[PDB]
Design a protein around this ligand. Structure first.
Ligand SMILES: Nc1ncnc2c1ncn2[C@@H]1O[C@H](COP(=O)(O)OP(=O)(O)O)[C@@H](O)[C@H]1O
Ligand SMILES: Nc1ncnc2c1ncn2[C@@H]1O[C@H](COP(=O)(O)OP(=O)(O)O)[C@@H](O)[C@H]1O
Lengths: 235, 235
């Protein structure tokens, strides 16, 4: 019956915003390597939503080249007049973004070739801007160890988040107006299982839509009815 | 009138034989980087002349590839039936030289590409043998720094010889039967100028052929007559 919150600031969100603003204002490269289902994509989306001079793209294996990634960057910077070449595209990206004190955000940096990430680091080094990587722990694990070693000298900042926190899901429950202590422990048990923010928000929206359709309050019984579903331990 | 010595053991020769036998019996890679005119080529030739299970090739820019270098190696190992391919040539070189406890000697390793020296180090690592490099100081200076870094872990031994020694030219003068103290100082002055063994042996053979043609002994005057030639300080 109250509003379902689309987002809440957490301890992990306040950490990743600190590292984000650090990589931007420092104008240096930071890696966010950690297991997904923790919210780094939506946190970076929230940062780009709240703050200007911030740019965030995604990288697919269908867009794993240098040219496709720079085309994504040209679409993100607001330039539909991107040349199909690699050279003058790169120099136009260098022209547009110089002096902006901007921030480039890279999601799924584990799908990168060495030439692609090398062109991105030489780009940001020739632009005096900040670069932020996302993905699993393989993003850092592809570097330990000699081809990204100068990049390992440029990579100074990383905040690695494997699993969530107690105050993390506590602030989430505060956003969703949850005060049951057994409910708190059950949400922590949800946070124990992987895909934590995903499975958590699934269970929360199931319980919320159930409590609105039945006209009631989300209780621990609606949490068991939601979390008992989704077939997580089914092989 | 006595015999002109083709070779003498020196302190530098005893050092480079120690490093040579070390790289061979250790079955690991050693670098000899230093300015030429010091005798490393003739010392390695002397080592191969005195000792069995020892192989020494040269590398030209006309033979700077992997295939040409392995063809040189196949000629050096006594196999005229070398295939023109790169694969079965390399495996035949691996077959012939395994269990031999041999020594490969490389002259002018400064002309090497990374693929060539990488194939040589993977060869010797797949053969359990010793590899010895020669050349100027650029041989080590091409590594400081990430592509030969694992090779920098395999390169443990190096003896760098820039200039000669006092006992060096003293033993040379003892081979050439020289007992003048001013003659000793003048030979040291020859050793000060670069191309030391080359210019030294040039001056020695000029003085020796002069003393045989005039029927006399090599004196300090024949040393001035030889060393005053060769036009070293002429631009
Ligand atoms: N503050 C928040 N409150 C609730 N859910 C969040 C919050 N931030 C992120 N999420 C959740 O994170 C999920 C996506 O992030 P995630 O899959 O962890 O990204 P990545 O796959 O890059 O690690 C979304 O389903 C979203 O519900
Ligand atoms: N023991 C020795 N006595 C006299 N001369 C020597 C001796 N060893 C080497 N040399 C001289 O070294 C010269 C060639 O070696 P060098 O040019 O220094 O090889 P590199 O060019 O590989 O450094 C020859 O001219 C030879 O006269």
């Amino acid at each position: 019956l109250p509003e379902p919150p689309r987002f809440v600031e957490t301890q992990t969100v306040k950490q990743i915003w600190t590292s984000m603003r650090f990589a931007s204002l420092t104008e240096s490269i930071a890696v966010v390597c950690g297991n997904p289902g923790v919210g780094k994509t939506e946190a970076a989306r929230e940062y780009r939503r709240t703050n200007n001079n911030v740019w965030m793209i995604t990288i697919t294996p269908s867009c794993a080249s240098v040219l496709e990634c720079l085309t994504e960057l040209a679409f993100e910077l607001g330039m539909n007049d991107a040349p199909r070449r690699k050279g003058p595209l790169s120099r136009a990206l260098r022209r547009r973004l110089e002096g902006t004190q901007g921030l480039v955000i890279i999601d799924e940096a584990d799908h990168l070739g060495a030439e692609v990430l090398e062109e991105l680091r030489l780009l940001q080094e020739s632009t005096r801007i900040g670069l932020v990587l996302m993905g699993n722990h393989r993003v850092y694990s592809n570097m330990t160890t000699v081809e990204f070693a100068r990049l390992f000298s440029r990579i100074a900042k990383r905040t690695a988040i494997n699993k969530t926190k107690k105050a993390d899901v506590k602030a989430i429950a505060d956003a969703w107006q949850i005060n049951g202590e057994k409910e708190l422990e059950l949400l922590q048990q949800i946070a124990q299982k992987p895909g934590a923010l995903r499975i958590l928000n699934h269970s929360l929206r199931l319980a919320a839509m159930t409590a609105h359709g039945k006209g009631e309050r989300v209780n621990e019984d609606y949490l068991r009815q939601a979390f008992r579903e989704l077939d997580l331990d089914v092989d």
